[PDB]
Amino acid sequence: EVTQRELFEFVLNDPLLASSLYINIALAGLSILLFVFMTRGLDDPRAKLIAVSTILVPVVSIASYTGLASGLTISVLEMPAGHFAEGSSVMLGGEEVDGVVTMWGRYLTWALSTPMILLALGLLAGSNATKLFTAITFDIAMCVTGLAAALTTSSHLMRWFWYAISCACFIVVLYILLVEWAQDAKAAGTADIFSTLKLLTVVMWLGYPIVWALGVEGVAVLPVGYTSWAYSALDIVAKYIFAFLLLNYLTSNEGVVSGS
Amino acid sequence: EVTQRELFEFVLNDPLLASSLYINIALAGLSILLFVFMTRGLDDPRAKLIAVSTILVPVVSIASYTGLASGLTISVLEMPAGHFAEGSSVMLGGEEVDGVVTMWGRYLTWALSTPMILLALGLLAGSNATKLFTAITFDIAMCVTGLAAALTTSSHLMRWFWYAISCACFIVVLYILLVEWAQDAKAAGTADIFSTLKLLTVVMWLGYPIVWALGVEGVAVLPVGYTSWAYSALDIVAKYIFAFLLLNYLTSNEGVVSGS
Amino acid sequence: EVTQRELFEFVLNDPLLASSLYINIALAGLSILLFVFMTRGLDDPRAKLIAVSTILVPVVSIASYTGLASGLTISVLEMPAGHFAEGSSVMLGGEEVDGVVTMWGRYLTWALSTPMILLALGLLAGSNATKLFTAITFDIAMCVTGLAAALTTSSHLMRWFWYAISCACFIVVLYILLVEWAQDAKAAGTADIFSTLKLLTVVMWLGYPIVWALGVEGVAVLPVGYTSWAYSALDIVAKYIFAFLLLNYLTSNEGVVSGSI
Ligand SMILES: CCCCCCCCCO[C@@H]1O[C@H](CO)[C@@H](O)[C@H](O)[C@H]1O
Ligand SMILES: CCCCCCCCCO[C@@H]1O[C@H](CO)[C@@H](O)[C@H](O)[C@H]1O
Ligand SMILES: CCCCCCCCCO[C@@H]1O[C@H](CO)[C@@H](O)[C@H](O)[C@H]1O
Ligand SMILES: CCCCCCCCCO[C@@H]1O[C@H](CO)[C@@H](O)[C@H](O)[C@H]1O
Ligand SMILES: *C/C=C(C)/C=C/C=C(C)/C=C/C1=C(C)CCCC1(C)C
Ligand SMILES: *C/C=C(C)/C=C/C=C(C)/C=C/C1=C(C)CCCC1(C)C
Ligand SMILES: *C/C=C(C)/C=C/C=C(C)/C=C/C1=C(C)CCCC1(C)C
Numbered sequence: 001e002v003t004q005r006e007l008f009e010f011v012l013n014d015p016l017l018a019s020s021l022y023i024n025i026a027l028a029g030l031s032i033l034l035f036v037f038m039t040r041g042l043d044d045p046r047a048k049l050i051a052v053s054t055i056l057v058p059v060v061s062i063a064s065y066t067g068l069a070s071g072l073t074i075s076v077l078e079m080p081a082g083h084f085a086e087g088s089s090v091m092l093g094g095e096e097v098d099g100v101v102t103m104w105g106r107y108l109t110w111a112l113s114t115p116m117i118l119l120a121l122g123l124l125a126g127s128n129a130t131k132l133f134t135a136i137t138f139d140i141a142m143c144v145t146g147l148a149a150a151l152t153t154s155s156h157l158m159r160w161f162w163y164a165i166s167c168a169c170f171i172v173v174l175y176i177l178l179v180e181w182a183q184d185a186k187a188a189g190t191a192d193i194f195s196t197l198k199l200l201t202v203v204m205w206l207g208y209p210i211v212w213a214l215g216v217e218g219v220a221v222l223p224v225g226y227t228s229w230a231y232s233a234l235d236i237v238a239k240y241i242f243a244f245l246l247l248n249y250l251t252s253n254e255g256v257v258s259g260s
Numbered sequence: 261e262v263t264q265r266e267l268f269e270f271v272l273n274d275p276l277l278a279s280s281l282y283i284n285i286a287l288a289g290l291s292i293l294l295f296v297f298m299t300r301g302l303d304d305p306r307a308k309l310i311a312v313s314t315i316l317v318p319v320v321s322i323a324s325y326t327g328l329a330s331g332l333t334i335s336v337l338e339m340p341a342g343h344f345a346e347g348s349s350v351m352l353g354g355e356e357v358d359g360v361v362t363m364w365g366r367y368l369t370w371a372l373s374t375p376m377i378l379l380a381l382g383l384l385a386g387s388n389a390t391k392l393f394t395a396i397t398f399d400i401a402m403c404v405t406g407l408a409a410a411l412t413t414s415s416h417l418m419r420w421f422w423y424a425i426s427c428a429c430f431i432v433v434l435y436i437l438l439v440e441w442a443q444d445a446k447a448a449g450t451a452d453i454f455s456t457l458k459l460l461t462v463v464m465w466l467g468y469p470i471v472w473a474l475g476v477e478g479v480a481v482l483p484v485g486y487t488s489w490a491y492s493a494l495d496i497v498a499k500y501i502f503a504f505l506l507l508n509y510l511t512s513n514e515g516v517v518s519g520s
Numbered sequence: 521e522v523t524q525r526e527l528f529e530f531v532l533n534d535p536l537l538a539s540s541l542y543i544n545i546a547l548a549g550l551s552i553l554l555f556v557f558m559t560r561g562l563d564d565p566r567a568k569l570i571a572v573s574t575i576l577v578p579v580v581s582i583a584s585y586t587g588l589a590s591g592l593t594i595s596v597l598e599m600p601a602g603h604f605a606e607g608s609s610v611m612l613g614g615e616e617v618d619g620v621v622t623m624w625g626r627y628l629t630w631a632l633s634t635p636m637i638l639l640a641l642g643l644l645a646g647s648n649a650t651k652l653f654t655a656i657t658f659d660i661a662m663c664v665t666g667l668a669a670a671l672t673t674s675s676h677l678m679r680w681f682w683y684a685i686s687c688a689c690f691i692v693v694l695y696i697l698l699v700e701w702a703q704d705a706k707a708a709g710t711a712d713i714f715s716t717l718k719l720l721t722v723v724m725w726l727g728y729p730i731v732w733a734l735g736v737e738g739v740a741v742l743p744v745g746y747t748s749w750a751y752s753a754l755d756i757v758a759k760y761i762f763a764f765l766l767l768n769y770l771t772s773n774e775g776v777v778s779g780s781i
Contacts, residue, residue, distance in 0.1 A: 003413070003414075004412070004413050004414040005340070005413065005414045005415075007414070008414030008415060008418075045388050045389070045390040046390070048390050049389065049390045049393060052390070052393065052394050052397075053393075056397060056401075059398075059401060059429075060401075062425070063401065063404070063405050063408070063425060066408075066418070066421065066422065066425070067408060069418075070408075070412050070414050070415065070418045070422075071414040072408060072411060072412050072414070080525065128565050128781060129565075129569070129781045130565040130566070130568050130569040130572065130781060131565075133569060133572065133573075134568075134572050137572070137576055138579075141576075141579060141580070141583065144583070145583050148583070148586070148587060148590075148592060151592055152524070152590050152591075152592055153523070153524050153525065154523070154524040154525040154527065154528030154529075154590055154591040154592075155525070155528055155590060158528070158586070158589075158590045161586060162586060162590075165582065165583055165586070169579075263673070263674075264672070264673050264674040265600065265673065265674040265675070267674070268674035268675055268678070269674075305648050305649075305650045306650070308650045308654075309649065309650040309653060312650070312653065312654045312657070313653075316657055316661075319658075319661055319689075320661075322685065323661065323664070323665050323668070323685060326668070326678070326681065326682060326685070327668060329678075330668075330672050330674050330675060330678040330682075331674045332668060332671060332672055332674070
């Protein structure tokens with residue numbers, strides 16, 4: 001029975017963990033201010049939709065990272081027989097506790113933020129509703145199944161079956177980004193900025209399942225602290241700079257996206 | 261350790277607490293039967309959409325209040341060091357239990373009912389998709405971060421940080437109600453009814469973050485039973501009477517709200 | 521003190537229970553491959569929306585059934601006084617545990633998939649946004665209040681009160697399916713197929729609250745393993761075959777539903 005307080009103190013006293021988390025909370029807040037200021041000029045409703053959708057990314061990120069830092073969305077789980085992190089221990093409170101400190105809260109960051117990124121990119125590319133619906137539903141399925149994998153402690157094999165379903169959903173999102181929206185952006189007159197954001201999104205997103213497989217959730221070659229910093233670095237690019245690049249464009253081309 | 265039945269019994273056997281819960285269950289139930297009856301004559305689809313979104317308010321309310329009354333959405337939390345309610349006891353059942361009875365279920369009632377209130381009001385004001393999206397998203401963020409605040413026990417200051425984040429989201433919603441949709445109602449031809457509903461909402465909505473701060477979750481000047489009734493009083497106005505007013509107007513201005 | 525592993529193992533070792541779960545994981549997966557293959561030639565965006573909504577049904581189902589088989593969305597609950605399943609035991613890990621193995625994960629399978637079934641049927645019927653919004657919101661309310669009913673252990677009466685609220689939400693869905701969309705399909709040119717799929721849906725959907733009342737969650741004439749197969753059988757028809765029938769039509773009549781999103 002680990003308390004939220006003990007997990008909160010655990011993040012603290014842990015150099016890599018505390019920094020990877022609190023640094024994103026600060027970068028998330030600064031992004032919001034920068035983005036709100038960068039977009040005060042917008043007037044086109046559609047251009048503003050792309051703007052707000054994008055601003056929600058760091059908004060979800062600051063709130064979600066606070067969920068982790070606070071200890072609210074953190075748990076200690078025991079990995080099943082065969083798992084490379086099975087048998088691990090953690091010092092919480094005044095005793096050694098079996099298990100791994102699991103930052104499941106990240107999956108909430110992803111479930112709520114990724115759809116916004118997709119909504120922004122889809123609108124930017126001039127996507128019809130079918131593709132937006134397809135990309136977003138499967139993106140959500142990808143995040144939720146990823147969370148289920150991280151939460152499964154009954155069977156090592158089951159954790160990886162979850163991982164495989166999540167990857168299949170990932171592929172659907174990738175196909176829309178790489179093939180469908182790439183084409184739609186041409187008709188939208190945003191093919192250039194879309195290619196840039198598209199490349200950045202694909203490379204960064206491909207990084208998450210890699211970190212998962214290598215971190216404590218996977219084969220654990222990366223300690224709980226390094227797994228967290230890997231994710232945090234990826235978020236900075238996939239979220240904060242991605243958002244800046246998109247907004248930097250929008251604010252100079254409000255006329256191009258001003259449609260229906 | 262505390263069972264659901266023990267919380268269910270705690271609510272009963274306590275006139276204040278129970279009355280603030282079972283009364284809203286009955287009032288909600290009656291409001292549904294009344295709202296459905298009231299709108300049975302509607303024929304326009306857009307008008308019908310506003311009525312259903314409004315009818316969902318008391319639907320979500322009766323379900324959520326049942327969640328609280330049954331003990332399903334209630335928990336016992338120990339406040340952090342420095343919290344005005346630290347070191348409290350409850351006596352769940354017949355044993356003295358440390359902590360405070362936390363009715364976190366109210367937040368779900370809010371995260372699900374407020375978007376419906378906003379959707380109805382936005383449509384009534386002739387709002388475009390951009391503003392509805394902005395209003396609803398930040399509103400949900402408001403409710404979720406508010407829930408996170410109540411559920412945080414690791415730090416006293418963390419709770420207020422959540423509270424601060426939620427207030428920021430609250431201001432975004434308020435701005436759209438007061439400034440944005442105020443102008444939209446004009447062109448939509450519902451400027452006069454929106455005024456009454458706008459005021460009512462902004463005044464009633466301001467009561468929640470105030471009650472929070474004064475109740476057990478906040479500085480704790482109001483006992484658990486008084487906070488409950490404070491919220492229930494607010495729910496009765498911001499939901500039932502507010503919904504009756506909106507519906508009464510809608511049924512009288514179906515033609516106007518339909519557009520063409 | 522019941523762990524996810526103990527529940528995972530309880531399912532395994534229980535022939536009825538393991539089969540009701542793993543068979544659907546397999547049929548859901550085969551359904552997805554079959555459905556993606558069937559709809560490969562679609563081009564119209566409205567036709568494709570109907571296809572994706574339908575395909576999402578077995579996608580949700582495979583994930584959620586894995587949730588159940590893994591033990592992630594299963595818990596042990598003790599029924600309230602007067603409940604026909606009160607005082608039951610389950611034997612987990614090694615000792616006897618009071619309560620009933622509660623597969624609440626099924627409600628998540630429902631709350632996420634039923635909306636897709638409705639979206640697909642609504643579009644097939646040429647429904648306007650109002651009825652679609654009304655059908656989907658009350659359907660979700662139906663699934664959520666149902667989950668609350670199963671999760672309620674404090675009062676036997678409260679359990680059935682949640683059940684009644686859920687039924688009322690169900691009546692809204694049924695009304696839209698039987699009265700509203702039945703007429704819209706005529707104007708959409710999809711009466712024949714819609715009426716068929718609507719009827720198949722209504723009959724199967726009616727099966728769920730009946731199983732709930734007869735199963736371990738209700739009067740318990742059906743033990744845990746049997747209530748599970750009752751639900752798994754309903755799912756096979758209401759999801760996999762229903763979706764297969766709907767896609768069979770879609771892929772031979774793209775032009776009829778082509779219209780515009
Ligand atoms: C309109 C829906 C409102 C639901 C009202 C439910 C109230 C039922 C209370 O029942 C009683 O609860 C006590 C405490 O658990 C038991 O000791 C007692 O034996 C049982 O009879
Ligand atoms: C389609 C989804 C595929 C998942 C199939 C899950 C079945 C794997 C069961 O594994 C076995 O479970 C036993 C009891 O827990 C262990 O004693 C044993 O060592 C382990 O190997
Ligand atoms: C068409 C659906 C009909 C639903 C009928 C539900 C009735 C369930 C009543 O339960 C009983 O209520 C008593 C008084 O509250 C408790 O003392 C007792 O312990 C409890 O078991
Ligand atoms: C649609 C399905 C119909 C729901 C039927 C549920 C009613 C359950 C009745 O149970 C009985 O209630 C008595 C109190 O009233 C208890 O004294 C008795 O021990 C208990 O067995
Ligand atoms: C702000 C967060 C972003 C952009 C997150 C992106 C996350 C993914 C692309 C995650 C994908 C995963 C899989 C495909 C497999 C299983 C594990 C996950 C959840 C890490
Ligand atoms: C039916 C329910 C209604 C109209 C609820 C409204 C709720 C609010 C305006 C809540 C606001 C809050 C904050 C601004 C700060 C933190 C705590 C909350 C959640 C009480
Ligand atoms: C894929 C799943 C399907 C088609 C599920 C359908 C479920 C229902 C129609 C459930 C209805 C219920 C009630 C009306 C009352 C309370 C209990 C439920 C949840 C079983």
